[PDB]
Amino acid sequence: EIDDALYSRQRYVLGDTAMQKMAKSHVFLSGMGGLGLEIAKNLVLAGIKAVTIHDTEKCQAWDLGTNFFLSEDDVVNKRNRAEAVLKHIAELNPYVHVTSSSVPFNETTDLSFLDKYQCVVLTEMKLPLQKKINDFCRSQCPPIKFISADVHGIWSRLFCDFGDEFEVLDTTGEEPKEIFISNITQANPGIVTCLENHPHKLETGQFLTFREINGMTGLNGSIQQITVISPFSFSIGDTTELEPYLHGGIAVQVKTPKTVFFESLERQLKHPKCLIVDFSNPEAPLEIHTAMLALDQFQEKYSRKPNVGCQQDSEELLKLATSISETLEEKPDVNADIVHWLSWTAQGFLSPLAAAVGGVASQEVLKAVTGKFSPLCQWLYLEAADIVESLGKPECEEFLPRGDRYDALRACIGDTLCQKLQNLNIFLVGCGAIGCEMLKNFALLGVGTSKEKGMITVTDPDLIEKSNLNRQFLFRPHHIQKPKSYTAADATLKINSQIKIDAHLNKVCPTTETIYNDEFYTKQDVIITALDNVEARRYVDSRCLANLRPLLDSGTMGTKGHTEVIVPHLTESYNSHRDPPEEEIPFSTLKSFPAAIEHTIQWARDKFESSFSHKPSLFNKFWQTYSSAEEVLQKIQSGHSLEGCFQVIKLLSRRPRNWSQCVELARLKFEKYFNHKALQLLHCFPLDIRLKDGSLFWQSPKRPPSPIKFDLNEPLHLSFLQNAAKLYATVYCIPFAEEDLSADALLNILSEVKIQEFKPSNKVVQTDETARKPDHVPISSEDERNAIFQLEKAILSNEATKSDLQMAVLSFEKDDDHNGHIDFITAASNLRAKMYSIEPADRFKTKRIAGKIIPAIATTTATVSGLVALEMIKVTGGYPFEAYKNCFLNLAIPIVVFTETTEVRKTKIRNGISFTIWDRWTVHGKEDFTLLDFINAVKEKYGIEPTMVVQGVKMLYVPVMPGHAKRLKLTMHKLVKPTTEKKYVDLTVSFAPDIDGDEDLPGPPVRYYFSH
Amino acid sequence: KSLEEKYVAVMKKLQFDTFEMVSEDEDGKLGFKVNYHYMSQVKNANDANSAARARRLAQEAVTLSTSLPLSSSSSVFVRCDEERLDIMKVLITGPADTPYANGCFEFDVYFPQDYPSSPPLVNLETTGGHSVRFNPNLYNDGKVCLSILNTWHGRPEEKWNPQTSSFLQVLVSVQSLILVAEPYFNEPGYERSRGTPSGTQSSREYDGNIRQATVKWAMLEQIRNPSPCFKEVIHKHFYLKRVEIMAQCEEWIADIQQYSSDKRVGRTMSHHAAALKRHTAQLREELLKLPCP
């Protein structure tokens, strides 16, 4: 059975069928360089039932720089890499049966042993045996999914082949859309018109079913294919034969399987199917294919890789590429620069690219065994040539090996760049899975290891949890509840002992700005954000903009992800993005007119919070502000209009004292929610009630509710009452036992319980579909007189002790099962949905929606983060604007799109002068320096006349204010009212426009120092 | 007849000005020198002030100082803290023929951080103990209901617009929609009661109640307990309007007695007439006492 507490986030991505398929999955992987290790780690974290790892080579000292598990002892013993890393990888997932193999692979090797596996992955392999294995796997029934990948220096290759036909069960991870129909005409084809406030959001050739249609009742359950007519209409085929349309109707998306056809590896070398990652250079992947095949031919011919700076090797590789290109169908021009750089960096191994392509290959393997997403077809190539391109024409001494744990990276990037990386001071905020793997990548890269400067700073307030163990791979079950930053640091010293790292347990926010002051920011070089929210991103971006430091960011949403690059004096900031504010469910919709499952889920969540978090806190706060019931009685007798005392007394008069009273309170709350409110609403609006135009009131999106009779025999009612009674007894501190939750005891209590009858009322229904949250109805006489009577009777019953006057406040726990919050909210949401004829939702989906849990997987994390690290190298190198590449990806398609980051916009101010966000003007002053002096100094220094000055929220001078010309003569040290915190003050200025009456053109922030 | 021209000429110097609201030590401990509605929210606002907010406020201040509405019937008075911006206060004179005729109404206005994204918060403080629902759009607590403020029913075009809407338009809408001769019909369903003697009679009751409440608070309490912000201005206004105040109150006494002819609603009109006569005697004492300021 699925371990929900470990796997829920991945479950929300894949679906239970995918994991059930992986419960039977056997996967074989051969070749344990960095790429193979990363792929194996990703697959083990995913939860493949059985993984067979394999290698035939032994640990080199060179291999230590490409591995995060091996040790110098392994090299000394010359242990084979497979079983060497087998020890560590076993800790990742006990549920995974990890095995090992070391059978040498060659032409005479029998491949029949591979029949048990569903997917086979090869790395560092020679091409003819790749071809033979591909022939073997595709000839099996069912064919074995074949994946091959390699990494050479700054270049990588990814190929997949799933046989002649590969079944795809799901083409996209999104839920099937549902659209409310406004009108459908009788025509051939019929014209379907949606509620045209919302767009069609569907495409031609898609498949739909329909339900709850009136007028054309024959379309109930009808199944049609569609063709889009407009962004708000579409056709589904003939409807002329149908009856006339009247009202109602919802179009429901139907998910349809698909089959994608893959060609053999050898035949895919010619006319290769390539996926473009840069639409500005779609020719580049074909060039990379040709160059990689030329490198394979060179390796086949000479049994060695080309040497760095070997002109003969580069010439031979160019000749081979030219010859091979002439055998291709398209015969493109061979990129001599690409060939030269490949020859230069043939022997290197660049770890971040390896991790990224490993994550991509892991997702391809995941697709191969499930059919959950549309797979790559068939070739993919990634590049790091941007880094070397900015180097011009360096020389081999930068890249020659020197015997350390960084020779592989040195052969790629050059020794000086490595020294720059070792001297880097990197501040990382947040320690999610992204933070952990980024720290791992830095350890692999030797970043922040130099004694003089190189330091890595990390901070995070959260503690380790079981659910985080699924993708935050550094941690273990016995690390639970330990600080994330501290444990993550401790794990990384194992990877690299030369690292210099500091860790903190602090949330990053304005209150903690004192620790992370601008002096701390100055000591840093680059800042990396692994946040999960927008406001902290805004705060960090504003701080780094104020401190003029580069910033990088990454967001992950299931198979989708993106990377953001910000460089001073070159790009925009995160606070440039103005993504629209999120949706708000109307108050009327949530309270009275829910049309969707999410509405009922939100209603249940809000009701639970109000009942058990908000109201108990209000009760405790009221009985902390006021101490005696008799004192409150004396106050209200003297006309004190105390706030919420009526509701406090109502709650106290309803305070249960034993378990049976708690259960009956739960039952009466059930009645109020599920019969009385529905009856009241239907009393206000009968089923046949109609609008001013005579149209139906209870029509789309207004779904008519229906009252529900209680029945203990119903499992939903049973669970709801059990959870409600447990929660109420927790708040009221009434002790109980698990035997009290038995259906027998509940039946015995219910036989004693009697239910109050419903009564209609004239409470005004806020039908306004744009209605905000209203204010409370004022205290009627009934309220205060009932409050007086009930407090008096409570005093008579002696229910006035501090235990009676205070209750327990329950937090919103969402992951544990014993709290039962998830069960209660699911039961309430299901009841409310059943009221409005809305389909009930399962526990896991309710937990996802109610908890706002982001569906995530470690593979997408590693994929985006490899690119993030790559861009970190470019930021370190100080490359021009062209090098930096913002990127977006959606592995479900799969699709990758590199794009230039947004260029900084020059804010023209006046007379050709302009400023940028990377600008903050300064003026040094003195004690007698005045505001007129400040204005004149600004005019002299920047050639533009100030018009008005403001200190934060506070007006300093405005021309049209009476007698404010005197403020010009006043001195800074007095008018500013400075604090001793700074030598300066920050302020805002605007300047005169060319057209009279236009608002003064805003300039950059201006800082005035009080001294020189 | 030159009274109107002198009224316009004199108080145009008094329409737009600043008066000091915030009181602090050098440590920034926030206090306030007068009564204001949003004391806590001034201290609880975020200090990462957006430059767009300040520039919009300055431009609006210029626009008001250049184009404030001004007539003895209906006028707008602008005062703001001399140091801070988002804290705001207005004074509005009720047009003629209305139950608010020639009364004055002080308002408290606050501007949020996101401004101009959202309309400024507006609330009337002249409700007199916050018990008089002076308008269907102005409840007892003083809440202001207007479409442009997103506090009243209407179309999105009638509602707030961060780019096109201006506070001067809000003030004009207040003058044109709130201080009206038919406030009873402002509530939905009462404009439907128009054309019937019952609706007109209920309007008589409501308008007489509003008349007496205005005479009580908007004139008598505004002169006997003036806010220091508009203290001198309101005294000058009522000094210049003292003759028409007497004429208007005598006319209201005569007219409210016409409504008093009815048996039951005329009894409520008699109560309002007694209150009106009491407050008229008090205001007449004040007018006799009040010299040229």
Ligand SMILES: O=P(O)(O)O[C@H]1[C@H](OP(=O)(O)O)[C@@H](OP(=O)(O)O)[C@H](OP(=O)(O)O)[C@@H](OP(=O)(O)O)[C@H]1OP(=O)(O)O
């Ligand atoms: O205060 P909230 O938690 O937001 O919910 C309240 C609450 O219902 P519960 O009894 O389920 O807590 C009120 O009951 P009391 O707190 O006063 O006991 C009830 O008011 P009534 O007792 O008058 O029914 C009111 O319902 P309504 O707004 O229809 O008056 C309802 O509000 P919701 O509809 O948002 O739950």
Ligand SMILES: Nc1ncnc2c1ncn2[C@@H]1O[C@H](COP(=O)(O)OP(=O)(O)OP(=O)(O)O)[C@@H](O)[C@H]1O
């Ligand atoms: N302002 C902040 N300062 C420091 N750390 C922050 C800040 N905001 C968020 N974080 C960190 O961001 C991390 C987010 O990590 P991640 O996206 O992997 O999920 P999570 O919070 O561990 O768990 P879940 O899956 O329940 O959301 C948290 O560990 C949290 O500590």
